[PDB]
Amino acid sequence: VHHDGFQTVKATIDWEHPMFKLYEKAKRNGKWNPADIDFSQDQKDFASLTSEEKISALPLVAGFSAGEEAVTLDILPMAHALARQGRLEDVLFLTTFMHDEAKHVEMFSRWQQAVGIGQMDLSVFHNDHYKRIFYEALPEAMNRLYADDSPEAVIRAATVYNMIVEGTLFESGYYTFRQIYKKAGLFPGLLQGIDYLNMDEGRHIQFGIYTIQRIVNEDERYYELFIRYMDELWPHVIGYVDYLTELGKRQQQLARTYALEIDYDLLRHYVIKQFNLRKKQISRT
Amino acid sequence: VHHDGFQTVKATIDWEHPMFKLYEKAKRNGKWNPADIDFSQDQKDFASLTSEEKISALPLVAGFSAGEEAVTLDILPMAHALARQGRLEDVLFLTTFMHDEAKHVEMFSRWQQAVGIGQMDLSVFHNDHYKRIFYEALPEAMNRLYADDSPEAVIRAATVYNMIVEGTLFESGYYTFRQIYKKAGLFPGLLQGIDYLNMDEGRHIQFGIYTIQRIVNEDERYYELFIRYMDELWPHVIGYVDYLTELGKRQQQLARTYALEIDYDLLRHYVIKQFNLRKKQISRT
Ligand SMILES: CCCCCCCC(=O)O
Ligand SMILES: CCCCCCCC(=O)O
Ligand SMILES: [Fe+3]
Ligand SMILES: [Fe+3]
Ligand SMILES: [Mn+2]
Ligand SMILES: [Mn+2]
Ligand SMILES: [Mn+3]
Ligand SMILES: [Mn+3]
């Protein structure tokens, strides 16, 4: 449908808009390039591993790789919906968000290729709870926005995408990955890339907080929708966590080799802590 | 709708895909930041101008500013359509395209703000032919892709967006701007920014060529659709050109002051040349 006018012809950008400020920070802080990461040591590390130790690492990489690819595809309807509402500064920021996620997809795929598992199908490590979030609930909630950009729909999309997928699952998975392979001294290239992902993902979560809060600000009853949508997804979050925990407890060979007391009870509580602090970044009032 | 799988879990990125290579070049060559351009001299230049000389420059800036904003909003459906076709490397590249266009919107709006015309509504310099392309034909052709991603629809979208708007109008407007203010020694910040835009816009046109050619490759009868769609838009392209030419010939005070023989007959032929060379970058066979 037609444009009825253009904000940067009638006026200018709103320079004080928080999403313009987040866009400015994204450009300053978003220069890293996955093509510059040296993965040569990661290739040697992975080759030096036993077949048993090789499994230990792949579940998390399977969840990350599909997850980055899903959000790369699935952020587009948010950008559409906010563009159609005339939120120009939000759109500008979302271009950095989308470009970040492209680099995240690229980074994991470069690592898979470098270490020699690119020809290997990692979908086996997606159980039913993972599929429910990433193959179903995430794309349903984002795609809805093409036909329904009601406050309810926008809160649900930001909750699933930014508060659950990024703010709970990815944050916990990054913690987990550091807590294991940084200790073991393994996979330096991948850990460099993950550190970059984690920096980008702070801006993505901030966008989600801003979006949810500005809707709650209009009407505190949206607050209850937010909590409800968070709690509806919790079972699949912990059901993927329990399944990875069960996979890790079945293959405790890397823990032994590298002298890691992988405390799954401590990981689990980090997931719970992440989930609960995302709730507290949204004020009812 | 659901994801049935993820390419970077089952396989990797197709590293040899031309759009992956264009994505790689976009990251290497896309570091510039409009926030780093010094516009202080542009502010003084614009203040030093007479009111008559002030008009001379605004028509082109009005067309650029609305144009960048239109393509920022209107590239999203292309990214959607190709994502839904599973063209992952195209999507990765299109994230750089979208982020480039955000910076183009930002750059013109920073210049308008710096020189003191931000509070001024430049829509008056959009005649009916401009509105037909940017307010109507462009968004219609891109938005169509949400419901109709047939080869015909994709060629039409790339033709309007990449071959006409970028490949004819923007290219000619950049030439024009250099041919005038680079000669006059005016507006150094804006000319720096335009030089950056022009570098980005080479990649955007290449995406359009690749997209049109790969469809023509399937069936040379799409070639005739391409030419037809180019010729349908030509009247509005030259009708905006004739109208800017008429505006420039009515305000020949900047030419006098700055000793510029602004050869509109030479500009006009550059537009015609641009239009015809875009046609020749698509092979029938
Ligand atoms: C032990 C808890 C692990 C949570 C890992 C989430 C990984 C992901 O899919 O991004
Ligand atoms: C004298 C020919 C001028 C063509 C200017 C196109 C400017 C634009 O809208 O990008
Ligand atoms: Fe993210
Ligand atoms: Fe462009
Ligand atoms: Mn279960
Ligand atoms: Mn006319
Ligand atoms: Mn990511
Ligand atoms: Mn542009």
Author numbering:
A (entry chain A), B (entry chain A): 2 to 286
Passage from the reporting paper:
Following O2 activation, their cofactor catalyzes a two-electron redox reaction which results in the formation of a tyrosine–valine ether cross-link in the protein. The tyrosine and valine residues are conserved in the R2lox group, and the cross-link was observed in both R2lox proteins that have been structurally characterized. Both proteins also comprise a hydrophobic channel leading to the metal cofactor wherein a long-chain fatty acid molecule is found, which coordinates at the Mn/Fe ions of the cofactor. The mixed-metal cofactor in R2lox self-assembles with the manganese ion in metal-binding site 1 and the iron ion in site 2 if both MnII and FeII are available.
Moreover, A171, which lines the fatty-acid binding tunnel, was changed to phenylalanine (A171F). The latter mutation was designed to create a cofactor geometry in R2lox more closely resembling the R2c site by blocking access of the fatty acid ligand that co-purifies with the wild-type protein and coordinates both metal ions. In A171F-R2lox, the fatty acid is excluded from the active site because the bulky phenylalanine side chain blocks the ligand-binding tunnel. In contrast, in the oxidized state of A171F-R2lox, E167 is a monodentate ligand to Fe2 as in the wild-type, whereas E202 adopts the oxidized or reduced state conformation in roughly equal proportions. However, cofactor oxidation by O2 appears to have taken place regardless of the E202 conformation, because an oxo/hydroxo bridge is clearly observed in the electron density in the position occupied by the fatty acid head group in the wild-type. Accordingly, the A171F-R2lox cofactor can adopt a geometry which is similar to the oxidized cofactor in R2c, with two oxygen bridges instead of only one as in wt-R2lox. Judging from the electron density, the cross-link was formed equally efficiently in the presence of O2 in A171F-R2lox as in the wild-type protein (inset).
